[PDB]
Amino acid sequence: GAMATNFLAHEKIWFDKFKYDDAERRFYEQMN
Amino acid sequence: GAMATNFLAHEKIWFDKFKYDDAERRFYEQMN
Amino acid sequence: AMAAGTLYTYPENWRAFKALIAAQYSGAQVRVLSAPPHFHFGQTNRTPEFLRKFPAGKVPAFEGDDGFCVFESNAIAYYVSNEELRGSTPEAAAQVVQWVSFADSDIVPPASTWVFPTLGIMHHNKQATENAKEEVRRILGLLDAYLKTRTFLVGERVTLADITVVCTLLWLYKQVLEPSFRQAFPNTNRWFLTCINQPQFRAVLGEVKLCEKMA
Amino acid sequence: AMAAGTLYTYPENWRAFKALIAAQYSGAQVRVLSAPPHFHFGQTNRTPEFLRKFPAGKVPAFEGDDGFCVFESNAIAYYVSNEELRGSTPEAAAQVVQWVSFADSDIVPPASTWVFPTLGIMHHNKQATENAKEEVRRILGLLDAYLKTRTFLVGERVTLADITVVCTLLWLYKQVLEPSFRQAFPNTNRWFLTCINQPQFRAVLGEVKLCEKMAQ
Amino acid sequence: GAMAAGTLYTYPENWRAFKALIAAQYSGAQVRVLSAPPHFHFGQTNRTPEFLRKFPAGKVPAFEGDDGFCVFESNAIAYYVSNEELRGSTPEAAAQVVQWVSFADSDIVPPASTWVFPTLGIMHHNKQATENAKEEVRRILGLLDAYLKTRTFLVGERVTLADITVVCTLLWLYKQVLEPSFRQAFPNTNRWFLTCINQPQFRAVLGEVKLCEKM
Amino acid sequence: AMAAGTLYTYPENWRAFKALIAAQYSGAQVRVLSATNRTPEFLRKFPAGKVPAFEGDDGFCVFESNAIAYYVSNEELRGSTPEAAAQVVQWVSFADSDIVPPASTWVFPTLGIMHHNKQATENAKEEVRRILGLLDAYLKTRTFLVGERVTLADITVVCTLLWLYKQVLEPSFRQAFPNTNRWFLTCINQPQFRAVLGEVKLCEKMA
Amino acid sequence: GAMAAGTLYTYPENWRAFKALIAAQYSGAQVRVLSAPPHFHFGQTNRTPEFLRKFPAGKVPAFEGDDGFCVFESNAIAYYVSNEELRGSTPEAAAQVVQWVSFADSDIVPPASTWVFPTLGIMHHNKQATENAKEEVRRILGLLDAYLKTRTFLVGERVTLADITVVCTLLWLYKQVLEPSFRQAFPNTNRWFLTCINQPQFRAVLGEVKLCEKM
Amino acid sequence: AMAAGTLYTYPENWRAFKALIAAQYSGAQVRVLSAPPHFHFGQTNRTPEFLRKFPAGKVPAFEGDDGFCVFESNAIAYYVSNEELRGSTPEAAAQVVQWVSFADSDIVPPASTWVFPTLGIMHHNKQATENAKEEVRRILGLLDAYLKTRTFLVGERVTLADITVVCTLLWLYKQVLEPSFRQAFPNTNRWFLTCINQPQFRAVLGEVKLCEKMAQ
Amino acid sequence: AMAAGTLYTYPENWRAFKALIAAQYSGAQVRVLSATNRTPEFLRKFPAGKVPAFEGDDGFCVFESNAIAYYVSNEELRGSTPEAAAQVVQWVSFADSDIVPPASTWVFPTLGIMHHNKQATENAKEEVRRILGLLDAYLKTRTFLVGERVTLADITVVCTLLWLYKQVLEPSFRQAFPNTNRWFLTCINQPQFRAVLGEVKLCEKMA
Amino acid sequence: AMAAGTLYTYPENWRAFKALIAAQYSGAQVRVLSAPPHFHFGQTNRTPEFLRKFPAGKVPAFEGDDGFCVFESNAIAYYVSNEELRGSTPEAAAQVVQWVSFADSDIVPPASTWVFPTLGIMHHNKQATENAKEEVRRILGLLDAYLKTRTFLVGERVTLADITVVCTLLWLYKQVLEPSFRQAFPNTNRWFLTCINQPQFRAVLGEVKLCEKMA
């Protein structure tokens, strides 16, 4: 509802950060 | 593949007949 | 000697119309029971008495005055017919069986698929309707070629062939076969209009208005 | 009287078997063409020449020696039959139409739904399959009650009724009607076994083995 | 009804989805579950364009029938996959079902959610969230208790969407916070709740349910 | 036959409006009596002690505005097929869950029922825009929410939106939702609607 | 790879889907299965417009990633949800994987299907379908047998998409027709096949596999 | 020296706790406004007046008595801290930034993924949840090795490092880190318990109960 | 470095063409030697006894035209991301499963490799129309099948379609597929393609 | 006394640029190891020796010549800075912490979401990109208002505030911020162009070409 929506809008947690960090790691590892 | 496709095109089984017969039965039963 | 008996069905049942039209030709005395208290569809046909006579419990169901019971609309129509309607020779008889079976196998399923949503019997699916339209185009075209130099399907007179195919096509022509759609099939339209305007058909079907604008 | 002609079909077509068994009883001379160069399923029945005579594009298709063409399987079986198989009286003839019609509208769709996957033809979900199994129990039970004090469906002799219903049940009995499933219908099982071991049936069907365990 | 078949979009263990899943156990409807997650974009929860095409409010549960019929809102979905008995067989019974469904949504869901999960309310300045919700729930259980004193189920004599809906709305409370010393006062409500969740149709969706122990 | 009985409520109640409009369509006979919602007899019939509450002439009792409206409706307002009926429940449920909260927040400070809160109403404005926008896309190619005729869906959603359109949805604000506006105007101008609502004037200048 | 997540469209117990499902057990990829049936329209098998939008060939299995990436063909799906080890860590290993995958599709699938399900081939005038397929399969198992004499797996020293693909292509044969007296000649192939299907990643998708008994 | 001002926040905000605990050590005078009419979460922080001073629209937000505004939680905790909490030397100050940064980038996202559903805030699939549990084991193990022969993270005294990392782990330890899960990290558990029972932590956090059984 | 070795095949083999075109792009050195595909040494290296077959100069052996083409390719032809690589496998698999059977049936009677069968080819024509139509919708907004550059996907699908376009896809037949036609023409006119295929003439009058 | 040491990183790492630019200002002698044999990303950083010094095994990683080790790019940048870059007063120091934390919390995630597909690091999702664009619009606008009457973010001189925010914005300005998009933010564009053209930035970043047409 409105409360959860507000809380999440405020926190802006990057829940997908592990996906990005993992893709990025792999990307730079492969330039060898 | 081509064989199953031909066989089924030839037979034209009305697999959904029970759905139609059931809807139709219900339709005419309810006019009471 | 022509059949005499009772026909159980809900009203406006094309499956029952086949028998009733056949009876107009043959002279069979078929009385319809189709309304309470006599016949309450969904109740009367599920009683042990009814199920005794008609084990599948479906309609139409025919009980002759001599006790003889028949189910399946094709069999009832056959029984209350005369020899000419059934086909006078083995050739004609076989051709009647041919068109009756074609109607059930090829016409009823796309006809139902297309028409039932327009009647509020089934939810409408656009893809199913589209495929059914194209199957009906194929069927009308097959009939159109066949009727090019024929007045009726079998032996140049009305038989169960015409009666059955016409009844299975009836809801399509009422509900969804608009002029621009059926225009491609002048022989089929001519034959259909001819049949439903025969005195024996009209006695059962009344006046039939062809689809103005597709439902 | 009797029919003489040529029958086009793919091999192992239950719809063709109806006519061929009927011909065993009647004495009709039916030449079967079911292999190239004379018939190629999916090709021959789509050609203009074929469609000229058999507009539906279906097999079996029958052309008499005199040129008479018939293009639907119930009609072909009717044509190659004799008066007893068709039904001697209007009462019997009516009952034949009843059972032929019953097989086409009630048996073929659930039978197909259940059996076609076991043959690798298609897949159906466990809902459609379960509905099919239930419809088939209903059909076998109806037949079971009907055959309690009957040898055959109509007039105590083989008619098109038996031939047609047996041919529509044939794959079910071979593929999925295992002893535990079919146990509840002894009169139907007995009538089925009775029919398929008739000399006229065996001549067309050969030896039939009943399902020992349900195909899945 | 029995013939409805389709895909229910939702995450697992969702009491809102449970309403339709349990209804389908009664009706025979075939409901399969697809649990695809939403996207989290910088504080915002979003769903795919295809999802929003069918379900523009972007909420789950959402249901797409195998014939393409789309419906959202857990109550409407549960309605759709139900039969006439669960919906209410008469306008009286049907109206009573809408009554308890509506009562569940308006009066039970807010304090139930708040008592089991008070964190958000406290953050938004509802200081006494827990004690306030506990009193509302006490009032609700007492209302059900008096009503169920002489009744097996909320409407008529068998399970309807009324029971299914109210049970699902009470499910977390009974698992997480309704202690024996608290629930002791509502033996009627407890009995009805136990009678519901122990039926095989509820069990198939809910599994074994352990009631809250002393905390 | 349709229902006949007494509806307990104060007038000027949009929840009551749903049932009364529905009765205009169905031909149900609904006598309106004011509210007592705490006496043992009332609680006896209506345990939750909420209004509106309906007692049929045959003694049948029902509460919740949705259930009352359902009861005095006919098959067509309820949904004559299971798909249409499910869509009716759908829109009714959406009105309760998604429209009622922000609608209250915004329109309440302008009717004196709640105190003004500038940012609270600015937040509510945004949620209302999302709802009007959702209805606008849906109604782009449709006359009514369900099937081809007014149903409880339209009646319910209109009534939930009624005060917004009267008080705060001024021209510039609502101009982005021409389809929602037309659908709303089409509904409230029906005889059945005007019979209960009278002559509705759309907002002139955001109150 | 481990990070791939998405929805696999397919009916259950599909060996083609098994390829990707087993690969995902190795990789860590999260693959959920949605089994929505096609439509049968008068002899024609059709899928929804939304499905054809993403998967225009209209075939299953088909895969839609949670980020909207769409791919069809069972080999491509299995490739996508695999990791580098299963795909082949070097161009040599990767090429060998494409080799066995391609060999499976071209040489094993047709006689495997025909021997287990000969009905369609017989109907289309392949009279000796069974005996012909049995000889092709005999040749294939003999080829694998010689190759696996000195190897644990088809490529390198661990399971790759090569093993997964060939095992899945042989699965029905080993269950339904590869009798002990027939398979006796291929102890190498049998050993490799047993070593594969008994690994937990295969077991999680295939369950317990019973090899064909004497018929 | 020391800071004096007003702090806006919703109540029970771990991000606000960082600053408030820091103020316990330093002696900063921080007035908390966390309830209407002075602060309404989702409303006050969206108003133009608020945004004028605190453009990010986030809380905690700090306005000094002298008008100095700071709008991000690490910065507020830094400002209300003293020199020892910030890091006395560049080496220590660097280590504080390291751990503060580590908490923000490594701990907060999996912690949130795991804990928010248990609090009824949202749902995550069992994949995201499982990845989160694994990331948290990695984090607790890293901390465990690090704290083997350390009392606190930096320079053998409480700094912003401990305060920040403890505040980011607080919900995890309350909600989901049951004895069987946290068993493998005795040095981390010991350090956590050590910190939260510091008089300065207790003054802000009150009594903390460690998860007895994992919330689900 | 790229591959270098011997490719065993008869020339005029479209399966071989895939690898040879691929090598034009990658700079792999591929010497073509005729075929022997039943001697113990051949079966020793290539157990299945199929051509094409590739033996690297370092002794590495591989068979199946898809695997050989893969091996002498570079990362860009193979798909430089897992998504692009999966799309490559996708189109290659679709060419093998869906295009090769009807393509053979139709074009074989016009190259003397199979006997004429009027209805067989009419059936095949229809299946080819469905495939051309599928490619046409896909290529409406795309230059190539995968990413922005030629990959094995284009090479494979072009080669599988090569004989159809030469022999039977006459103007009137192919006019319904302008996007597929343009994509095909764009591919075969690449230097890398012409180097192997020479100058391809699109069908003039359905052979 | 300014730091001296080794920085391990793969090349062209914006996270490493922060430290290297800080070192230009402060005079710290930071030498980069970023290529084999000295540093092989994915191998060197996973050795027990490396993990001894840097337990998370990530880059950038700094080892001073006196043995002192730091990880996390913010801490490394802080350490190799001078007092002016760190913030000379508690007010300035706090404002630097503020902008460094804002960059990580608010800028990095949408920046990554938008940019990674253009670099071939992630598969492109249109909805994610669209949401990231709008989040970047919000961020550029916040900066634009803040920099209206400021030359730099803190205390009218370059600090870690500018260096960090600029490095986190760098890929956006190179890859996707086309003239028409960034036109709305003249103060942010002015400040960004000013910073990257400072001698100390250019020493590390070289010549930076602003996005012509969006990637």
Name the fold adopted by D82-216.
Glutathione S-transferase Yfyf (Class Pi); Chain A, domain 2 (1.20.1050)
CB-CB contact of G197 with G206 (8 Å): yes
Q: How far is C106 from chain G (nearest CA, A)?
A: 8
**Can you tell me the distance from the alpha carbon of F152 to that of F73, in angstroms, rounded to the nearest whole number?**
8
> What three-state secondary structure class fits G13?
coil
Q: Is E68 on the interface with G (CB under 8 A)?
A: yes
| C82-215 CATH, one of 1.20.1050.10, 1.20.120.550, 1.25.40.20, 1.20.1430.10 | 1.20.1050.10
In this complex, the residue of B17, B20, B25 whose CB is nearest that of residue C116 is: B20
Q: Say whether C91 and D68 touch across the interface (CB within 8 A).
A: yes
**Can you tell me the distance from the alpha carbon of F168 to that of F170, in angstroms, rounded to the nearest whole number?**
6
Kindly list the residues from chain B whose CB atom is less than 8 angstroms away from the CB atom of residue C57.
Answer: none
Strands I53-56, G5-9: pairing kind: unpaired
Q: Say whether C123 and F81 touch across the interface (CB within 8 A).
A: yes
**Can you tell me the distance from the alpha carbon of G110 to that of B1, in angstroms, rounded to the nearest whole number?**
11
Strands C61-64, C4-8: pairing kind: antiparallel
Q: Say whether A11 and H112 touch across the interface (CB within 8 A).
A: yes
Kindly list the residues from chain E whose CB atom is less than 8 angstroms away from the CB atom of residue H35.
Answer: 125, 127
Tokens 């939680």 belong to H73
Q: How far is F136 from chain E (nearest CA, A)?
A: 11
CA distances from I4 to I31, I49, I71, I195 (A): 8, 21, 10, 18
CATH, domain range G83-215: 1.20.1050.10
The per-residue DSSP string of chain H comes to: ---EEEEE--TT-HHHHHHHHHHHHH--EEEEE-STTT--TTTGGGSHHHHHH-TT--SSEEEETTS-EE-SHHHHHHHTS-HHHH-SSHHHHHHHHHHHHHIIIIIHHHHHHHHHHHTTS----HHHHHHHHHHHHHHHHHHHHHTTT-SSSBTTB--HHHHHHHHHHHHHHHHT--HHHHTT-HHHHHHHHHHHTSHHHHHHH---PPPSS---
Alpha-carbon torsion, ordered H162, H163, H164, H165, to 10 deg:
40
In this complex, the residue of H35, H120, H121 whose CB is nearest that of residue E125 is: H35
What DSSP character marks residue G158?
S
Kindly list the residues from chain C whose CB atom is less than 8 angstroms away from the CB atom of residue G42.
Answer: 109-110, 131-132, 135
Tokens 């007046």 belong to H49
Q: How far is D119 from chain B (nearest CA, A)?
A: 10
Å resolution of this model? 2.0
**Can you tell me the distance from the alpha carbon of J20 to that of J18, in angstroms, rounded to the nearest whole number?**
6
**Can you tell me the distance from the alpha carbon of H55 to that of H187, in angstroms, rounded to the nearest whole number?**
40
**Can you tell me the distance from the alpha carbon of G169 to that of G164, in angstroms, rounded to the nearest whole number?**
9
CB-CB contact of H192 with H169 (8 Å): yes
CA distances from C200 to C4, C159, G158 (A): 18, 12, 80
**Token code pair at residue D33:** 């063409």
**Can you tell me the distance from the alpha carbon of F75 to that of E90, in angstroms, rounded to the nearest whole number?**
12
Which has the closest alpha carbon to I4: I30, I39, I26?
A: I30
Residue B4, domain extent: 1-32
Which residue type does A6 have? N
**Do I1-73 and I74-207 show the same overall fold?**
no
Q: Say whether F120 and H44 touch across the interface (CB within 8 A).
A: no
**Can you tell me the distance from the alpha carbon of J157 to that of B16, in angstroms, rounded to the nearest whole number?**
77
Q: Is E30 on the interface with D (CB under 8 A)?
A: yes
Name D98's Cβ contacts closer than 8 Å, sequence gap at least 6: C70, C71, C72, C74, C75, D161
Report the length, in residues, of chain G.
Answer: 215
- Exposure class string for B21-30: b at 16+ Cβ within 10 A, else e: bebbbebbee
Q: How far is E7 from chain G (nearest CA, A)?
A: 8
> Hey, which residues 91-120 in chain C have their CB within 8 Å of chain F?
120
- Each domain of chain C, given as residue ranges in start order, spans 1-81, 82-215
Q: Is G204 on the interface with D (CB under 8 A)?
A: no
> What three-state secondary structure class fits J174?
helix
**Token code pair at residue H42:** 């989702």
CB-CB contact of I24 with G123 (8 Å): no
- Residue I8: its H or E element: strand I4-8
Mutate to test the interface with F, among E99, E103, E140, E189 (most CBs of F within 10 A): E99
**Token code pair at residue F77:** 């307002």
Mutate to test the interface with D, among E27, E30, E32 (most CBs of D within 10 A): E30
CB-CB contact of E114 with E132 (8 Å): yes
Name D118's Cβ contacts closer than 8 Å, sequence gap at least 6: D175, D176, D215, D216
The per-residue DSSP string of J23-62 comes to: HHHH--EEEEE-STTT--TTTGGGSHHHHHH-TT--SSEE
**Token code pair at residue D84:** 């007893």
**Can you tell me the distance from the alpha carbon of E183 to that of J186, in angstroms, rounded to the nearest whole number?**
65
Which residue type does G140 have? I
The terminus-to-terminus CA distance of chain C in angstroms comes to 44
Name F198's Cβ contacts closer than 8 Å, sequence gap at least 6: none
Chain B neighbors (3+ CB pairs < 8 Å): C, D, E, G
Kindly list the residues from chain I whose CB atom is less than 8 angstroms away from the CB atom of residue G95.
Answer: 62, 67-68, 70-71
- Residue D69: its H or E element: strand D69-70
**Can you tell me the distance from the alpha carbon of G10 to that of G51, in angstroms, rounded to the nearest whole number?**
12
Q: Is C123 on the interface with E (CB under 8 A)?
A: yes
In this complex, the residue of G35, G120, G124 whose CB is nearest that of residue D120 is: G120
In this complex, the residue of C10, C109, C112 whose CB is nearest that of residue B28 is: C10
> What three-state secondary structure class fits I54?
strand
Kindly list the residues from chain B whose CB atom is less than 8 angstroms away from the CB atom of residue E3.
Answer: 19, 22-23
Name the fold adopted by I1-73.
Glutaredoxin (3.40.30)
Number of Cβ pairs closer than 8 Å across E and H? 39
Count other Cβ atoms within 10 Å, centred on residue D203: 12
The per-residue DSSP string of chain F comes to: ---EEEEE--SS-HHHHHHHHHHHHHT-EEEEE---TTSHHHHHH-TT--SSEEEETTS-EEESHHHHHHHHS-HHHH-SSHHHHHHHHHHHHHIIIIIHHHHHHHHGGGTTSS---HHHHHHHHHHHHHHHHHHHHHGGG-SSSSTTS--HHHHHHHHHHHHHHHHT--HHHHTT-HHHHHHHHHHHTSHHHHHHH-SPPPPSS--
Q: At what angle do helices J14-26 and J160-175 cross, to 10 degrees?
A: 140
**Total structural domains within chain A:** 1
The HSE-up count of residue I70 (CA atoms within 13 Å, CB side) is 29
* Among chain E residues, CA nearest to D131: E3
Chain G neighbors (3+ CB pairs < 8 Å): A, B, C, D, E, H, I, J
ω into residue E118 within 30 of 0, thus cis? Answer: no
Number of Cβ pairs closer than 8 Å across E and G? 18
**Can you tell me the distance from the alpha carbon of F53 to that of I198, in angstroms, rounded to the nearest whole number?**
87
Task: Report yes or no on chains I and D touching (3+ CB pairs under 8 A).
Answer: yes
> Hey, which residues 1-40 in chain E have their CB within 8 Å of chain B?
3
Q: Please, what CATH class does the domain formed by I74-207 belong to?
A: mainly alpha
Order of all β-strands in the sheet with F4-8 = F29-33, F4-8, F53-56, F61-63
CA distances from D137 to B25, D116, D182, D198, F114 (A): 20, 18, 8, 25, 66
Which has the closest alpha carbon to H14: D24, F56, A11?
A: A11
**Can you tell me the distance from the alpha carbon of F138 to that of C75, in angstroms, rounded to the nearest whole number?**
50
Sign of CA dihedral D11, D14, D16, D17: positive
Count other Cβ atoms within 10 Å, centred on residue I41: 8
Order of all β-strands in the sheet with J61-64 = J29-33, J4-8, J61-64, J69-71
ω into residue G61 within 30 of 0, thus cis? Answer: yes
Count other Cβ atoms within 10 Å, centred on residue J20: 25
**Token code pair at residue G97:** 């994987």
Q: Say whether E120 and A13 touch across the interface (CB within 8 A).
A: no
- Residue G181: its H or E element: helix G180-183
CATH, domain range E1-82: 3.40.30.10
Q: Is G32 on the interface with D (CB under 8 A)?
A: no
Strand-pair partners of J179: none
**Can you tell me the distance from the alpha carbon of J60 to that of J70, in angstroms, rounded to the nearest whole number?**
9
CB-CB contact of I99 with I130 (8 Å): no
> What three-state secondary structure class fits J9?
coil
**Token code pair at residue C113:** 């698929």
3-state secondary structure chain C: CCCEEEEECCCCCHHHHHHHHHHHHHCCEEEEECCCCCCCCCCHHHCHHHHHHCCCCCCCEEEECCCCEEECHHHHHHHCCCHHHHCCCHHHHHHHHHHHHHHHHHHHHHHHHHHHHHHCCCCCCHHHHHHHHHHHHHHHHHHHHHCCCCCCCCCCCCCHHHHHHHHHHHHHHHHCCCHHHHCCCHHHHHHHHHHHCCHHHHHHHCCCCCCCCCC
Instruction: Compute φ and ψ for G5, nearest 5 degrees.
Output: -150, 140
Q: Is D146 on the interface with C (CB under 8 A)?
A: yes
> What three-state secondary structure class fits D100?
helix
Task: Write the burial class of residue C79 (CB in 10 Å: 0-12 exposed, 13-18 middle, 19+ buried).
Answer: buried
Q: Say whether C128 and E67 touch across the interface (CB within 8 A).
A: yes
**Token code pair at residue H126:** 């069992």
Task: Report yes or no on chains G and D touching (3+ CB pairs under 8 A).
Answer: yes
**Token code pair at residue F29:** 């006979």
CB-CB contact of H204 with H24 (8 Å): yes
- Residue A26: its H or E element: helix A17-29
Q: How far is H188 from chain J (nearest CA, A)?
A: 15
Q: Please, what CATH class does the domain formed by J1-81 belong to?
A: alpha beta
Task: Write the burial class of residue E215 (CB in 10 Å: 0-12 exposed, 13-18 middle, 19+ buried).
Answer: exposed
